DNA sequence: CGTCTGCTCGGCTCGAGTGTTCGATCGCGACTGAGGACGAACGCGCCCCCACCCCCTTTTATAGGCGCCCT
């Protein structure tokens, strides 16, 4: 860590074979992919509103632009359309 | 006037639903090939019947040979 080194011994190590997947990874540009993209952004926006101390709760746009910098700001504008002014 | 944020609108992409076509076994059906059994006709064998020829005797002349019977 930042403060120093720490040492443990280990005695047990597992080898994991070939995985049998139980969850389907979406494809690129899929409907499930884009749904997750906007849902994740919406959850981050709600949790930034919960963390806000001023009443009424207020956030800044460039916090979201620091978190999601590949997003066009139009997508963020629409996620803020419903729930913020 | 420039920047930024939001709102609307347009275009593109992807997913889902449906309908048509084809094949995927397929589940019967038709139909010909393969295989003894029974009845009728023939030829065919077997049996029976018919036909023909000789044997029963008598006679009579006549004679050589073989066998038997009582004198």
From Swiss-Prot:
Modifications after synthesis and translation: Phosphorylated by casein kinase II in vitro.
Cellular localization per UniProt: Nucleus
Domain of life: Eukaryota
Record remark: domains: The Bromo domain mediates interaction with histones that have acetylated lysine residues at specific positions. The second domain also recognizes and binds histones that are butyrylated and crotonylated.
Sequence similarity: Belongs to the TAF1 family.
Disease: Dystonia 3, torsion, X-linked: An X-linked dystonia-parkinsonism disorder. Dystonia is defined by the presence of sustained involuntary muscle contractions, often leading to abnormal postures. DYT3 is characterized by severe progressive torsion dystonia followed by parkinsonism. It has a well-defined pathology of extensive neuronal loss and mosaic gliosis in the striatum (caudate nucleus and putamen) which appears to resemble that in Huntington disease.
Subunit structure: Component of the TFIID basal transcription factor complex, composed of TATA-box-binding protein TBP, and a number of TBP-associated factors (TAFs), including TAF1, TAF2, TAF3, TAF4, TAF5, TAF6, TAF7, TAF8, TAF9, TAF10, TAF11, TAF12 and TAF13. Interacts with TAF7; the interaction is direct. TAF1, when part of the TFIID complex, interacts with C-terminus of TP53.
Function according to Swiss-Prot or TrEMBL: The TFIID basal transcription factor complex plays a major role in the initiation of RNA polymerase II (Pol II)-dependent transcription. TFIID recognizes and binds promoters with or without a TATA box via its subunit TBP, a TATA-box-binding protein, and promotes assembly of the pre-initiation complex (PIC). The TFIID complex consists of TBP and TBP-associated factors (TAFs), including TAF1, TAF2, TAF3, TAF4, TAF5, TAF6, TAF7, TAF8, TAF9, TAF10, TAF11, TAF12 and TAF13. TAF1 is the largest component and core scaffold of the TFIID complex, involved in nucleating complex assembly.
Protein name from the UniProt record: Transcription initiation factor TFIID subunit 1
Organism: Homo sapiens
Gene giving rise to this polypeptide: TAF1
């Amino acid at each position: 860590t930042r403060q120093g080194y720490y040492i443990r011994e280990l005695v047990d190590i597992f080898v994991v074979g070939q995985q049998c997947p139980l969850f389907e990874v979406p494809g690129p540009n899929s409907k499930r992919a884009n749904t997750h993209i906007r849902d994740f952004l919406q959850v981050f926006i709600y949790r930034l509103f919960w963390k806000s101390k001023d009443r009424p709760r207020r956030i800044r746009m460039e916090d979201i632009k620091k978190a999601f910098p590949s997003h066009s700001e139009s997508s963020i504008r629409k996620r803020l359309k419903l729930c913020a002014d």
